[PDB]
Every structure is written in structure tokens, then in C-alpha cells.
Amino acid sequence: TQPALLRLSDHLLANYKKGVRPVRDWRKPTTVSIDVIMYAILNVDEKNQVLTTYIWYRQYWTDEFLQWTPEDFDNVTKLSIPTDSIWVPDILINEFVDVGKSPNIPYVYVHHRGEVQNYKPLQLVTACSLDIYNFPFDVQNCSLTFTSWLHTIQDINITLWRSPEEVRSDKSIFINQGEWELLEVFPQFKEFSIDISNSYAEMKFYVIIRRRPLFYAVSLLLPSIFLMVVDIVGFCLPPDSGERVSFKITLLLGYSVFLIIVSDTLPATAIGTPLIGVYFVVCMALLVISLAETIFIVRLVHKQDLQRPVPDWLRHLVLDRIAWILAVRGLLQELSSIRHFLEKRDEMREVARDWLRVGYVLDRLLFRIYLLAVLAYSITLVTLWSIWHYS
Amino acid sequence: TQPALLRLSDHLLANYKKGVRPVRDWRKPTTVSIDVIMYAILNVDEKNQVLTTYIWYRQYWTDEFLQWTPEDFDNVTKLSIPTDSIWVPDILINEFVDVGKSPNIPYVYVHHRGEVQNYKPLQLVTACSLDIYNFPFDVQNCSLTFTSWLHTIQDINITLWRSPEEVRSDKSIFINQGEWELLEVFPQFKEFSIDISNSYAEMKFYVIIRRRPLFYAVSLLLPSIFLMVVDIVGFCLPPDSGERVSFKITLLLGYSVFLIIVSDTLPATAIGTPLIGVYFVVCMALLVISLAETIFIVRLVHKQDLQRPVPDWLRHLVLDRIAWILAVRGLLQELSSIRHFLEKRDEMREVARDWLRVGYVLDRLLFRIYLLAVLAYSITLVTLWSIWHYS
Amino acid sequence: TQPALLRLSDHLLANYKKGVRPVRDWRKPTTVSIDVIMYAILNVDEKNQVLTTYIWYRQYWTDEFLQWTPEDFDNVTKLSIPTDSIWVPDILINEFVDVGKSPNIPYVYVHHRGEVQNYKPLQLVTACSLDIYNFPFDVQNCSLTFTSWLHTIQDINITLWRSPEEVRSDKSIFINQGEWELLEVFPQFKEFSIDISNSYAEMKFYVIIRRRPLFYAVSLLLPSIFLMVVDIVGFCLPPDSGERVSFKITLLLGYSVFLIIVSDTLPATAIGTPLIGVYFVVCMALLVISLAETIFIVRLVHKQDLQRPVPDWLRHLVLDRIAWILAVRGLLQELSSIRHFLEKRDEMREVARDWLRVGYVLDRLLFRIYLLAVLAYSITLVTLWSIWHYS
Amino acid sequence: TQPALLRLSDHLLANYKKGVRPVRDWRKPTTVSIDVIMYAILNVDEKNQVLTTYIWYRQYWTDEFLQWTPEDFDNVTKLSIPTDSIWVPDILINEFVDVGKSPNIPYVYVHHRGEVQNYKPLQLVTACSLDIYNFPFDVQNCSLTFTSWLHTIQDINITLWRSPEEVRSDKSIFINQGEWELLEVFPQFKEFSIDISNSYAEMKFYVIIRRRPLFYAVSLLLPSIFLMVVDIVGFCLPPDSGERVSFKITLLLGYSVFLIIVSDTLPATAIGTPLIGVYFVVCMALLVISLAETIFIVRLVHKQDLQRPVPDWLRHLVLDRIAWILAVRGLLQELSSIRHFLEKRDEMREVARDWLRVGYVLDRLLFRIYLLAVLAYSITLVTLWSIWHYS
Amino acid sequence: TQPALLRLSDHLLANYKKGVRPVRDWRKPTTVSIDVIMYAILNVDEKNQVLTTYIWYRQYWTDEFLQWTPEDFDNVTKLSIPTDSIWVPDILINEFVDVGKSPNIPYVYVHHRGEVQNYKPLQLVTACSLDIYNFPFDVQNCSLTFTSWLHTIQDINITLWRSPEEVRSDKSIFINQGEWELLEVFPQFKEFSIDISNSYAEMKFYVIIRRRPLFYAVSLLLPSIFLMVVDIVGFCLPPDSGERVSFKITLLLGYSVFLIIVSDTLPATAIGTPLIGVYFVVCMALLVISLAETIFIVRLVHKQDLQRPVPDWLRHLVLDRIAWILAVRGLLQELSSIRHFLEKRDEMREVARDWLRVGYVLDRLLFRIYLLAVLAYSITLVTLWSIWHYS
Numbered sequence A, B, C, D, E: 001t002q003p004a005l006l007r008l009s010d011h012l013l014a015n016y017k018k019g020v021r022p023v024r025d026w027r028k029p030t031t032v033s034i035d036v037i038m039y040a041i042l043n044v045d046e047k048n049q050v051l052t053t054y055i056w057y058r059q060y061w062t063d064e065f066l067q068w069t070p071e072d073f074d075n076v077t078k079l080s081i082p083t084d085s086i087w088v089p090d091i092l093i094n095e096f097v098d099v100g101k102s103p104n105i106p107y108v109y110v111h112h113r114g115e116v117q118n119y120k121p122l123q124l125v126t127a128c129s130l131d132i133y134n135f136p137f138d139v140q141n142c143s144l145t146f147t148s149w150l151h152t153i154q155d156i157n158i159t160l161w162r163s164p165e166e167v168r169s170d171k172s173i174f175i176n177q178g179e180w181e182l183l184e185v186f187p188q189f190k191e192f193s194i195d196i197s198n199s200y201a202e203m204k205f206y207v208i209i210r211r212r213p214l215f216y217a218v219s220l221l222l223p224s225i226f227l228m229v230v231d232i233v234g235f236c237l238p239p240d241s242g243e244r245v246s247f248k249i250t251l252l253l254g255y256s257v258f259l260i261i262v263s264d265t266l267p268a269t270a271i272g273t274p275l276i277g278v279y280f281v282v283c284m285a286l287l288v289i290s291l292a293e294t295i296f297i298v299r300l301v302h303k304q305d306l307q308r309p310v311p312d313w314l315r316h317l318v319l320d321r322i323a324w325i326l327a328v329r330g331l332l333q334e335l336s337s338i339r340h341f342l343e344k345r346d347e348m349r350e351v352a353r354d355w356l357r358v359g360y361v362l363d364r365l366l367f368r369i370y371l372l373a374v375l376a377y378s379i380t381l382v383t384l385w386s387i388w389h390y391s
């Protein structure tokens, strides 16, 4: 003749009358507090300006109608009832691309003082700002908010329930060996108002996401230095052979088709410009001026219709090397004619030989100038790595 | 012995009887007003003729059955009740590709005068018209409507509640650094009727979306001028060497394979034709006539079976340069035979030399003509940029 | 003391008892009529044999239990009640790949005679037959049906409510500047029966969809004629130079890699064969026989181990051109030896010159034959365009 | 004063009490019968080991609580009631990748004997085994089951209601001109038990799916024979010209890049190996040995540092062709010196000519051997087609 | 006058009062046990750090309110009631990317002792850790948990109901011929607590997934050895011909474009580095040094401006081969001049011949050194296969 714990349950849930806002006085606003912790973060998308994450969520509010004494009710401090019976205030996240899918988990906590608690899992894919001005080391300053969509300041109040330093520095749960890592989150309470006499409660959390370069750094540094060092190899073969310019245009077309297929994949943005992309344009212009001096050296060496060398080429090159390091009479007539033809042919051959020599000398000089250019390239890389190492 | 605010709630919600249209007289139509503001806009698709956006939505109507005095009911002006109990008129958006996903947020406002309000978030992906006749600077004149699907003029009335200038010029909420930016929206109220005596209420909002070129302008202007300037480099090597035409067909195949892989990605439409695409066809025809004059210069220079030069080539070129800038007798017989063979060989060599010279002269002339063509290309680009800068 | 319009509502909805089929006599079948209009059509898929569309839907039936007089009930002819209370017969569409998503719009019309109406939006993505035998101008004869899934002939009757000519010719709502355009729809009422004594009602609508070629016609006609006309350019350079066959295999590999990447995209079918695809195979075989005659002309000209020309080559070519357009004695001995060597060398040179000449003559002849082949190609294109212009 | 047909309806549905298993005796198991017919089959996926289909489904069971006489109840044999009120046993399909989407169609049949029927449409995408050992002609032996997930043998009994031959041979509904065609389905009733005293009812249907080669057979046979016959063309040009090996490596790289891009698309599997894929490896090795003999013939012909021919090359080749088909004395001294130099040069030229001749002879022989290899290739193709034609 | 089995059903379900936690004493926690078996596993994704699987799930708990005697209640031991009426505790899986879709199957078991059972199918796609340090043979140590989200230790208790060895070794159901195979699962019960006095129950199952290499092993080993053995073929042609370096850069560009398109597909990770990828970089550097020695041999052989050979090249090579294996006077003057010119020309020709000889000797030596390098490559492959065969 003694009922179970459900006696208190149907004593409370007899006339709860959900759908009305539970207050003793309507002027006093109820308080629902916010708390968010980030369990994990999934992949982002730079095309859609969007990112995915999985955070654990918890909140509580004062229900104000559930009052019972701990004595003579079999010492009951807390119990479990479904969330469909209890009035639940709406805490809505903005800038979402779709509604977050989640299990129902229809259970909430209660307390004898009237405080009710709700622990729910909710994940969100949301669109916010991001920059790619430094793509290996980006700040990724995104924001996600928790506001009341339908209600005002005067009825719903949002607090923290924790110290802001404890929320700011919390690394209890986070999955490692991922591409992205957070260091801190930042709570902020600002009031939101579009027009006069309509101010709504808003709680904003700022996340800072650090991407770690381990794999894409090697995958970006390897093919550029690879094709540059095979270009350094491919300068060495002599220029009067015609396969050098075909080699270099083969290398140029290969670097072009590789540069097109890789620039759309990893910095896949519509508006932002990476710092590495202009560096690629500098590499393209450097390959272009290399092709231009190759064309010039190929043009400078030829064997047909070459005249005498100008004396300013001869005077400068010798200064460059020192700072660098009847049956008897008729037959004689025709034999002199044959000698004249052979002498003209050998004279043309010696002129072509001298043009080949001065072309070889200028080719060696311009190769050493390009080596100094590669040294400046390496100094730029070392300075960039030293700045990012100092941080 | 004094109840809470729920006394007014179950005084109102005792016999509300949802599902019937609440009027005192059925001839008088109720008024539901429209209001829309655009928080953000996501990406579009040119293939599916569709676009995505996220707008904040709000509306109100007269419920006509909820009447209570502010005096003696504890000064209650407004309160919150779920939207499932209240009759909600259907405001449906057309030309949608799927139903818009959204949270339920089951709460509405009421007032003592009978006016009820509903604030709901709804996003929409909808299919409308777009043109690509100017792809960097497009108008993007799309339309999205708010009509009553099931009801008529005579029962549901749609108004604005705001000035049309205030709706037309409103930039309170919009996310920056995106690819698309709106400048104004345009409200319009037109009646919709398919047959006789059936007119339905329709409210149409016209959006104008301006795309900003920052990244794709550089990404479209850089490779075309890049391959044209490396072609300008690649004209310089002499034509009698056979690697020039191989260089040019390598450049042509590279430009072709690049032009195919990039034309399907960014102007990804099935019907519309961009203005930049015909410009690409002009570039292809210009590269074709460059390849044609290259083939002509390669054909014009040869060393085997070349006859005497025609005098119209010789007369025109000298005018072009000035406006441009027994044991004793038998041995003599065989020696004369050897002289005859050597003289014939040297005569053929001199003829081939003259053909090489006139080919070189015509090659220089046609190169300068192509330089004038590049100047006309640049004048066209400067005129186009000047028109788009004047706007 | 006078109630509102809800008095008639709860006079009707007191004991409606949904879920039972409303008839006075069970032998008499109720009639639900069909009507469909096509607002818009979205993209199709040739891979999945499927297509998407958005049609406006409407239907009505006799509810037979709602009877009230217009007099003394405040002149009420029609009113609105939710569709969840009213028995709704199932009109199901077949050959669907998934359930169509749509808003609930839970409202229906009633009338005092008992006729109830329901206006609902429903879109459908459905799988049906299509052919690509003429891919620019296809018929696209698809079918979509409206049958009763669960009920029979004897209980549910399907009529039209409109003239079949008015349904057949109706262009009130359709979006323009799309890839697809319909000209007519065709209603048809056929009985459906799998076994004996089980006949079900079926209403079938046949849609005919005309695709308009504006963009893909240019995008398909431009690169083929482009590579053919650059081949016409590339025949001109002399064949004894070795870069001609490298040019032609470069063009052949480029046309092959372009033909592979474009044939999988636009005619993306698993079974059907387009008429344009065999035309591409004819183009490939024509490029192959061009490469074959190029290889033959390259083989026919050589300078080492060439014998005397056969007289059938010499007799045919001269007919082709006319219809086309001691110290004194020993030194003499060794000098005669040197003369013998030089005479042998010049004889071999003259033989190689004659082989070069006859190769050049045959090359010009075969080039003119290929020009006649291009004329036959153009006649085929003009005949095809004339047939499709006559229609 | 005479009610409608709903009198029998609320006589039956007063105390039906859904959720309890309807039996008069709990020891007697109720029988729910199975029946499945395949309306259509959609595409499959070889990567995800999964396939899609659309089957029509029907089943019935004995409800045992609905008993009414046909007399004095207005001759009612059958009527329609919603499926939410009637107890529905769970018939669940296994190896599904997601829950099948379907309309609710909430209506079932009843009968006066107590037999209730349910006709529902359900489509399924399910993962099962498949093999690609013969990819044009595969068996595709997949299985799909209908078991009771929650209940046992002792309460739910599964029968057929039709002859197994009539289920095995049924072609009433199937869409033609698709890639896949079934010839028969196979019913099988096996008991399923994991541990002792827990046996569950399982009904398994085995489907056999025949793929028809019309388009991909041509699309697979055309490019291989295409590149082989253009290789047959490309053997013909002389080997001492250097463009032959460049031609052949161009063809080899083109065939390699085509073979990579096509082998990942159509036989897109992770584990299974097709028979056509090893055939492609045989083609690659054949192209490799062709490139190897090409390199050997290019190496065998050279003009610098060639010694005398070995006599085993000279003896074998002549057997191969027959079975195949003071001022007076000093000037004489220097003239003899010039004769010595010219004689040495002509001797070296004749040696190089003989090496060119024997290289040409061996090239013709190896070309005819490769022609015999192409004949063996064709015999293999004819034998394969003859076996698949005999079947 | 004797009711059916539903008498016990509405004797039990009269006042069950769902939503309250059923206990006689609130201090005593109820026990819900866990059990999981893996029916099948679908594909994984290395990009999203996620994997898909389909497991069969079962659990039971003590309901504590359903008590009835087997005698006089018609011998009823167990019966079936819907799961919506019975209180169901929440067992939630973490690190999920979306909610798992599943049928409702709303039926549970009961027993006369009070024990209720629930058999439900649930599949899950979840994100966990994985490594690619050995991509053909990986451990794939993933974890999936079963915790109570809302409740504590003090109210919900999780046990096993089976021996841990029987759970660890269970291969009753698993689909074969897949890419992945499990060998064991590992249960573990650890307590989960974020702050003080809040400890929650957690049950963790560790799965170990072994991937089998059959197809991708051949698909990865075949093209690398293929291009290396065609490089071994392509070393053989003489280096003074210019097509060798064009051949090798054609092979290098083909291997580069193949290496780029295949490295993004199969090891598609953002952070992890495979062991095969560095092996590919070693192959690229080996091809680079092969191209470098090819460029060196091409540079070493030339015919213009070659001086006398240095004696250290001549002394080392002869040691390398042995360990390896008036009208009368004027005409005489001009004839001596012609002899001087011919002697100079022949001297230059002999010097160029000697340079060609020493280049050929060094080329053969470096080819044999590269053959020893290929032997070291093969020894590395054999050692790797021997280690993975020993395991």
C-alpha cells in the first residue's frame, strides 16, 4: 500500500502545462546559462567558406515550478523525466548551412531547488570568414554564436556558470594527429539590436584554429626544387645542338601543366590570394627569362650568312677572360681558281668557328649569372624559414 | 490560492480549435504581412541554374480570437505559446529544388490587441535565371517570391509593414569578403491568376547580385599573356633550324589542353555564351595564322632543287630595305672537268645562300607585322578596361 | 450568445471517423480526378537513366459525408480544414528513385455539395527511357504515371476534369532560356492488371522534351574543324625534313587525348551509341590514312642505297604533268682515279636528286586528293545541315 | 436512423489494442507469407561493393481478431483501414547500407475470414558479393534476404503462397534497353541460428544479373586495335632517321596515359582482377619488346667507328635472301698522298654503306616476325570470340 | 467469457507511467548490459579520417515493474510489446559524424522475472585515428565506444553478459572477399570523469582491421618496374645521336605526370606520410642522376672546338680496358697549300674520332655501374619482401 518513486513524478507532472513560460512574476527574467567544449573538429572547405566540427554541449535553466522537499519523499534529490514535457528555451546558432542532425536523447535532470539541467550532443557545419594570406601557417579566426532567436533581453538571460579563464584554457578532450589544432576559445557577451526597443541576448564564442604543416610542406617544396634542379642539370648540354630548346620547352610545359592541376586543389578559394601563389608567378617569370636567354644563345650561333665579328665583341671578351680566371699557263690558272674556292670555303668555316667560340663564352657567363640567381632564391627561402622559425 | 500566469494561458487555449480559419465575418479577409532581410548568401551553381542563400524571415497576422484586457490580468501585454496550437497560414516559396531544412523553433508572440507574430529562420536553394554575357561583371537578376499556395485573394491579404525605400536600402547584416555582394532588393506585389475567378496573392522580391573580380581576373589574365609573351620569345630563333615548328606546336598543344581544362570549370553553363570565350577563339585563330606563317617560312627555305630567284622577288626586296631602314692535253681536259664539277657545286651553294637571305628578310618583316598585331591586341584590352572603369 | 464559423466546423468534424472509406453504398465507387501542369524542368542524367522535374499538382474527390445547406449557416459555401482529418486516397507515381520531398501544406478545400479539393506541390526525380541516336536533336520520349497503388477499379475511379486538347496544348507556365523545352503532354487512361480479377486504375502522362542546340553545337563543331584546318596548314612543309611526322603525331596525340576527355562527358551513356561518335571514328580513320601516306612519302625519299628509277615511274610522271597542268704517265693515272671517285659521287648525288623530285611530285598529287576528300567532308556536313533544316 | 459502413469499422476498432501479438493460443504461430517481384534495377557500384534496385513488395498475414459475417452487415467482404492501427510484423532486409526511403501509403486490406493484406513499395540499396573475372560477361550472383529480426520460429512462420517455378520464371514487369537484365530469381528457405535454442526465420532470394555488352565492347576494342594498327603504320619509315624512336616513344606514352585513365574508371574495383587487365599487360610487354628491337636496329646502324663486318653475318645473310625470296718526283709524292686520303675516306664510306644494308635486311626480317605475332594475336581474339559465341 | 492474452497486456500496461526511472529503491542502480557483433564493414575514407561499418547490436536491462507468475496466466513466459511504451535507457556512441539511420523495429522482449530485451540494428560512420606508415600492411587501430550520455555511475551500470574471450574470438558472421578483414575485437570498461563528483559509465570496444594486398600490390609494383625496365632498354641507343636525351625527358615527364596523378588517389591523406612515398622520391632522384650522367655524356661528345686529349684521360683508359676485360715552282707551292688544308681537316677529324671513342668507353662503364645500382634496388626489394614474409 506504499507507492514507488512515480508518486512524486505524477505529483509534479499533473498540471505542469507546457508551452507557457514558467515564472512567478513576469517582470523577473529566467536565466539559462551557456557552456561549450570542443570534442573534435572535422574537415573544412575553402570553396564554400564553410567548416565542420563536433562539440559537446550543455546548458541549464531555472524551471521555477518544480519544488519538493527532500525529507519525507524518500530522500529524492534528482530524477529523470523526458524533455518533451518540460518547457525548453530556444538557443539557436546562426550562420548555419543546414540544420544539425543529432539524436533526440529525451531526458533531462531536475533538482529539488528547481534547477533543471540538459545535456545534449549537437554538431554544426557553419559558414564563417577565413583568410589564406599565409596558407601553411594561418590564424583561422572563425566565430560561432549562441543567441535566443525568438525571445528578448527582458525574459531570457544568458550567463557563463564558469570562469572565463577556465573556458579559455581547457584541453580535456581533443583528438590528436589531425590537420587542425585549437589553442584557445574566447567567450564574449554582446547585445544584439536591429531597431529601437528590440534587444536580444547573444553569446559569441571565438575559436582560433592552427593548421600544422607536415605533409603538404614536403609535397609543396619537393616538386618545385625538383624541377629547378633538373633545370640546373639541363643547362649543361651544348646550345648549338637543337635538342636543348626542345628539352626546355618540354620542362616548361610539364611545369605549367603541373602548376595548373595543383593550384586548383589545395588553395581552392574564389577570392583570397595566397603568398605562395605570387611566388609561383616569380618562378614562372624566372623560367621565362631562362627560356629567353636560351633562345638568344641559340640565335647567336649559326653557320650561314655570318659576317665578320664586330670589334667591341672582340675587345670585351679578351678583357672578360682575364678578369674571369698555252698548256702550261692555263692549267696554273684553273688550279689557282680551285685554290681560290677552297680558300673561300675555309675562310667561312673559320668565321663560323669564331662565332661558335664567342657564343660558348657568353653561355658560360650567363650560366654563372643564373647560379647567382639560384643563390638569391636560396637566401630568400632561408630568410622566410628563419622568420617562421622565430615566430 | 492565487494562480500563476498560466491562468490566462488556459483561459485562452481552452477552446481555440485549431484548423479553422479565425474570423468574426468570413467576408472580411485577414492580413498577413511579409518582411525579408538577407543575412548571407552562399555559393551558386551555373550548371544546375540554381543558387543558395540564407535569409532571415519574419511575418505577423491578426489572429482575431485572442482578446484580453491588460488590466486585472497582472499587466500582461505579451506572452509565448507554441506554434502548433495556433493556426498558421501557408506562405510558400516557388521554384525551389527541395524543401528548406530549418529548426522548428515552436514559439510565437501574441498581443492583447490580437496581433500574433512569428520569427522563423528559413534558408532556400532555388532555381532562377542568370546570364553570363559579361562573366567578370554580371548583373545576376534573380527573383524569389512569397505567395499563398492554397488560399485566395478573398481570404488572405499580403502587405509590407515597412516603407519600400527602407526595404530597398537596408545593409544592416551582410558578410563581407565574399565573391558576391548585393546592393538592393526590390519588393513588388502582383496578382497571380491561371483561369477565371481564381486569383491568388503573390509577393515577389527581386535581388541583384554583383560579383567582384579580384582573384579570377588575375587567374584569367595571367596564363593568356604568359603564353603570348613566351610566343614572342619563341619567334626569335632562326627558322631554318627544324626545332622552331616543334616548339610552336608544343606551345599550341599546351595552350589547347590548358584552354580545354579551364573552359569547362569556371564558365560551366550549358546554354549561355561568355564574351571571353569568343575572345579565346580569336586568340586560337591568331595562334593558327602564326603557325601558318611559320610553316610558310620553313617551306620557303630549302637547299635541294632550288632554281633561280624570280626578278619580282629581287626588285621588291631592294626597295623593301631602303624604305625599311697526248699526256699534256688529256690531263688539262680532266682537270677542267674537275673544275666544272666544283664550279657547279659552288653555284648551287650560292643559290641556296640567296634563298636563305630572302627568307630571313621576309621573316623579319612578318615578325614586325605580328608586333603591330600585338599592339592592336593591347589597344583592345586598354579600351575594354577603360569602358569597364568608366562604367 | 451567437457562435462563430467554428460551429459548422465542429458540427462536421465531430464524428467524421477518418480511416474508413466514405460511401453511402460500397458498390458505388468514388471518383478522384487527375490534373497535372509542368511549371519547370531541371537537369537530367544520362548515366543513371533518370531525370528531374518540378510540376504543379492538383486533384479533387467526392467526400460524400460533408453535407450542409448554404442557407441559415451564414452563407458559407467553402471553408478550410486540415488534410490530416480528411480521408485522402493514395495516388502514387511509379519508377521513382526516391520519395519526393515537399512541404506538408496541411489544408484542403470543401464545398456544400460534398466536393473536396486538394492543391499540393510535388516534384519528382524518376527513371525512364531515353535515346541518343540523334544527340543534338533528340525526341526524349519519357513517361510518368499516376496510379492507385493499394486500391482497385471497383472503389477508386480516375477521370480528367478537363478536355484532352486543353491538357495537350497548355503553355501557361514554363521557364525559358533553358536547355530543354516541351511542346505537348499526352494523357492516356489504360487499365493495369497482373493476374486475374485484380485490375487497378492507372493514368499515364507522356511528355516530349526537345533540347535546343546553341552552345554545345559550337563547342562540338569548333575543335574538330579547328584541328582539321591546322592539319591542312601542317601538310605544307616539305616531307624530307623530319619534323613533319613529329608534327603530325603531335597533332594525332592531341586529337586523341581531346577526343577521349570529351566523349565521356557529354554523351555519358552506358548503352546507347550516338551518331556523332561514329563520325568521330571516321575522322580518326581519316587522320590515320593521312599519317599512313605521310609515312609513305617519308619512306619514299632517302639519300642512301637508292638505285636507278624504274621506267614505269618515269613514263607515268611525264604523262602526269601534262594532264596535270714513269712520272708523266703515273700522275695521269692517279688523276684519272680522283676523277673517277668524284664522278661516282656526283652520279649518286644526281640519283638522290631525281628521287627527291619524284617524291615531291607524288606529295603534291596526294595533297590535292586529300583536298578533294575535305570537299566530300564538307558536302556531307552541308547535306546533314540541310536535312535538319528541312526537318 | 441507419448508420453507414463505419458501424462495422468502429465495431471492429473499438478494442483492437495494438502492440500485442494477436493469437487465440500462444503456442500456435501466425503465418506471414512473402512475395517479391522486380520492377526495375538501377545502377551498381563496383567500388563500394553495393547495388541499387527497385522491387515491388507484397505480403499478408492472419490477424485472427477481425471476424464478421458477410450476411446482415451489408454484404461487406473487404474494406480499408490504416496500417497504424493494425499490428504489423517486422520483415527486415539485411546487408543494407541505409534505411530504404518509401512513401507511407497507410492502408491495408482486410477480409471476413481474418486474412489481412498489405501492399507496399520498397526499394533497397544493398551490399553483396560480385566478381569481375569476366567483365563483359559476368554472372553477378547477388543475394537479398527477408528475415524476421526480432521474432523466432515459434511465433512467426514464413511461407511462399506461390509455386517456386512461377516465382522463378516471371517476366511480367521489367524495363528494357538497360545495361543489366535478369533471367530468373531463386527462392530459398533456410533456418538461421547463432547459438543454441534461438532459431529465427529467414527467406533468401537469389538474383542473377546479366550485363549486355553493346557500347563498352566497341569502346574497349576500338582504341587498342587503333593504336596497334597505327603502330603497324609506324614501323614503315626507315630506322636510320632518328624520328622513328621518338615516334614510338610518343605512341608508348600516349598508350600508357590512355591505359591509366581508362583502367580506373570501368573496372573500378579494389580487390578483383579482370581477365582483360592481364591482356593489357601482355599488350604493354609486346609494345616494350617492339621498342627494344627498335632500339637494337637504331644501335646497329651508325657511321662512326665501324669496323669490318664479321663473316658469320655475311655468310648467314646470303643464305637468308635465297631462302627468303726534285720538282717532278715531289709533286707525284704529294699527289699520291692526296689519293691516299681520298681512298681512306671512300673505304670508310663503303663500310658504312654495308652496315646500313645489313641493318635494313634485319629490319625487314624482324618486321615480318612481328607480322606473324599480330597473326597470333588475331587467332587469340578469334578463339576468344568463338568460345563466347558458343557459350 | 474468457479473454485472450491481451488481459495480461492491459494488466501490465495500465499504469506503467513511462518517463520515470523504474526502481524500487533509488539508491540501487539498474544494470543494462552491452553486446556487439560485427556483421560487415564497408569502405573507409583516409581524407575525412572516417570509416563506415554495419554491426549487429543487442542489449537488455531489468525493468523491475513487470512481475507476473507463469501459473494461472496461461503459461506465458515471454511476449512482445512496443518499445515506445517501455522506458529505454540511452546508450550513445561518440565521435560520430552524423546520426545513424536505422529502422524503428518497435518491439521488445519481456520476461516474467522482469528482464526485458531489445534487439536493434544500428550502423555507424565514425571518425577515429589511423596511420599509413605501412600502407599495404597497416594495423588500423580504431576505437568505438558505448557510453551513457545523460546518466551517471550511480544509476546506470554496464556489464558484459559474456566471457571476454568469447567476445574477443568470434567469427560467426563476416563477409569475405573484401578489402578489409578483422581478426579480433577487444572490450574494455573504463570510467569517464571530466570534473569532480561526476563519473559516467563508458564501455569501449577496440577493433583491429587488416587490409589484404592483392590488387593494389600488382597495380603499384607494375608501372614502376615497367618504366625502369623501359629505361634499361632506352640506355642502349648511342649518345651522340640527339634523340636519346629527348627520349629520356619524355620518359621523365611521363613518370612525373603518372606519379602525380596516382599519389593523390590511393594514399589520400593530409598529414600522414607513407613509406612507399619516400621510396618514390628515391626513384625520382635516381632518374635525375641518370638524366645528369646522360647530359654529361652528351656534353662530352662534340665535333667543334675540341682540343688534344689530356694525358690523364689516355693513361687511365688503357688501364681501364685491361682490368675491364716560275710555272714549275708556283704550281708545286699551291699544291702544297691544298695538301696543307686537307691535312688540317683530316687532323681535326681524327681528333673528333678519338673524343667519340673515349665517350663511348665512359658510357659503357657508367651503364654497368647503373646495372649494379639496379642490383642494389632488387636486393632492397627482396629484403623488404623477406621481412614482410617472415612477419
Ligand SMILES: *[C@@H]1O[C@H](CO)[C@@H](O[C@@H]2O[C@H](CO)[C@@H](O)[C@H](O)[C@H]2NC(C)=O)[C@H](O)[C@H]1NC(C)=O
Binding pocket: C141, C206, C208
Ligand atoms: C512516345 O512513346 C509512347 C509509347 O512508349 C507512344 O504512345 C503510343 O501512342 C500511339 C498513338 O498515340 C498508340 O497507338 C500507342 O498504343 C502508344 N503506345 C503505348 C505503349 O501506349 C507515343 O506516341 C510516343 N510519342 C511520340 C511523340 O512518338
Ligand SMILES: NCCc1c[nH]c2ccc(O)cc12
Binding pocket: A147, A148, A149, A150, A192, A194, A200, B056, B057, B058, B119, B120, B121
Ligand atoms: N537575434 C535573433 C535574430 C534576429 C534579431 N532581429 C531579428 C528580426 C527578424 C528576424 O527574422 C530575426 C531577428
Ligand SMILES: NCCc1c[nH]c2ccc(O)cc12
Binding pocket: B147, B148, B149, B150, B192, B194, B200, C056, C057, C058, C119, C120, C121
Ligand atoms: N499561387 C499558387 C499556385 C497555383 C495557382 N493555381 C494553381 C493550380 C494548381 C496548383 O497545383 C497550383 C496553383
Ligand SMILES: NCCc1c[nH]c2ccc(O)cc12
Binding pocket: C147, C148, C149, C150, C192, C194, C200, D056, D057, D058, D119, D120, D121
Ligand atoms: N498500382 C499497381 C500496384 C500493384 C499491382 N500489382 C502489384 C503486385 C504487388 C505489389 O506490391 C503492388 C502491385
Ligand SMILES: NCCc1c[nH]c2ccc(O)cc12
Binding pocket: D147, D148, D149, D150, D192, D194, D200, D201, E056, E057, E058, E119, E120, E121
Ligand atoms: N535473424 C535476425 C538477426 C539475428 C540473429 N541473432 C541475433 C542476435 C542479436 C541481434 O541483434 C540480431 C540477431
Ligand SMILES: NCCc1c[nH]c2ccc(O)cc12
Binding pocket: A056, A057, A058, A119, A120, A121, E147, E148, E149, E150, E192, E194, E200
Ligand atoms: N560521457 C558522457 C559525455 C559527457 C561527460 N561529461 C560531459 C559534460 C558535458 C557534455 O555536453 C557531455 C559530457
